[PDB]
């Protein structure tokens, strides 16, 4: 049925982010950090144009064979080249599983109201993956061994792939009934660009904040190392709550208004992080940041599907490749550019710049109220 497709997409995204987050504490123990995101950004539009040619089931199932190969390559690798190869393979997989899975969800839940909350649930998949990533990784790392986390995650990826092969049955290539509108015509749409830009700036704010916040906490607050890991918890829990609630709330409120308010709340929250003196001062603003990132993503993915349905041809592979490029731009240029700006003009000014950009971008979501057909 359809809820099994929703579960498959949720599980793919959850395992993808659990891997992405169990890898990050092991790596130091620069290019490797941005490698997955940039390779996924490169191979997003290709998958977008491919799902319209072979269908959704096959490029979503290749996303389990690529993520499984990446996972096992992480567990039995020592060299730096092999870790880079493993992270690039994870990037290609994730591209396959995010783009093809969101396309499948939008193709199956073909109703504007239902698509909202199923996108919300699939997105909360990423929050549940990031949130349960580090603890699982650590406990399985030290209580069993250093190859343990990745081999157990590989077993989980295999079980998810078994569910995939039993639900989707990717045996045969099935092209779409109608040829989807080209990628350039989509990219010339002022509304698809506004949606992608709102997702891009929200996630770039959060992706520049995550790595820059610990480097500032150890300098201003003299925080211990456990504090650095705990100070970012409100973001993930709040993103989980925000996505799961606003998938259902945004269509009653209006997706344009939910996106506008999410942008303004991300802006204000990020403008209000540098004013915190102690760790208890980074609970409320980080909560606002994560809550509003969810408020924006759970409102702007269904709108992507809707904007394609209303104006262009009903093929969702490319437009969700565009949405996933907007996602990945932030996580690719986040660490590097954020560290560069913080190393040059400081962390408070970086946060003020990001907040100003988000607040000034917010009024552009007004143009999503009633776009013409
Ligand atoms: N839009 C998903 C981003 C998101 C939610 N919570 C997070 C915590 C850290 C991070 O880099 C990113 C996130």
From Swiss-Prot:
Known outcome of mutating residue 206 to A: Abolishes binding to dihydrotetrabenazine. Abolishes dopamine uptake. Reduces FFN206 uptake. Reduces serotonin uptake
Subunit note: Interacts with SLC6A3.
Entry's Gene Ontology BP terms: aminergic neurotransmitter loading into synaptic vesicle; chemical synaptic transmission; dopamine transport; histamine secretion by mast cell; histamine uptake; locomotory behavior; monoamine transport; negative regulation of reactive oxygen species biosynthetic process
Effect caused by changing residue 320 to A: Reduces dopamine uptake
GO molecular function, one term: monoamine:proton antiporter activity
GO cellular component: axon; centrosome; clathrin-sculpted monoamine transport vesicle membrane; dendrite; dopaminergic synapse; intracellular membrane-bounded organelle; membrane; plasma membrane
Functional summary from the UniProt entry: Electrogenic antiporter that exchanges one cationic monoamine with two intravesicular protons across the membrane of secretory and synaptic vesicles. Uses the electrochemical proton gradient established by the V-type proton-pump ATPase to accumulate high concentrations of monoamines inside the vesicles prior to their release via exocytosis. Transports a variety of catecholamines such as dopamine, adrenaline and noradrenaline, histamine, and indolamines such as serotonin. Regulates the transvesicular monoaminergic gradient that determines the quantal size.
Tissue: Expressed in neuronal and neuroendocrine tissues. Detected in central and peripheral nervous system in particular in axonal and dendritic processes in dopaminergic cells of substantia nigra, histaminergic neuronal cell bodies of substantia nigra and tuberomammillary nucleus, in ganglion cells of sympathetic glia and in peripheral sympathetic nerve terminals in stomach and duodenum (at protein level). Highly expressed in chromaffin cells of the adrenal medulla and histamine-storing enterochromaffin-like cells of oxyntic mucosa (at protein level).
Cytoplasmic side: 49-57, 109-117, 170-189, 251-255, 309-312
Membrane side Lumenal, vesicle: residue ranges: 79-87, 141-146, 210-226, 277-287, 334-338
Family: Belongs to the major facilitator superfamily. Vesicular transporter family.
PROSITE patterns to which the protein is assigned, alphabetical: MFS (PS50850)
Outcome following mutation: residue 17 to D: Abolishes binding to dihydrotetrabenazine. Reduces serotonin uptake
UniProt effect for mutating residue 126 to A: Reduces sensitivity to reserpine
Organism: Homo sapiens
Result, substituting residue 17 to T: Abolishes binding to dihydrotetrabenazine. Abolishes serotonin uptake
Associated disease: Parkinsonism-dystonia 2, infantile-onset: An autosomal recessive disorder characterized by infantile onset of abnormal movements, including parkinsonism, dystonia, and poor fine motor skills, as well as autonomic dysfunction, including abnormal sweating, cold extremities, and poor sleep. Some patients have variable degrees of developmental delay.
Protein name (record): Synaptic vesicular amine transporter
Effect of residue 17 to Q: Reduces binding to dihydrotetrabenazine
Highest taxon of the lineage: Eukaryota
Effect caused by changing residue 214 to A: Abolishes dopamine uptake
Record gene name: SLC18A2
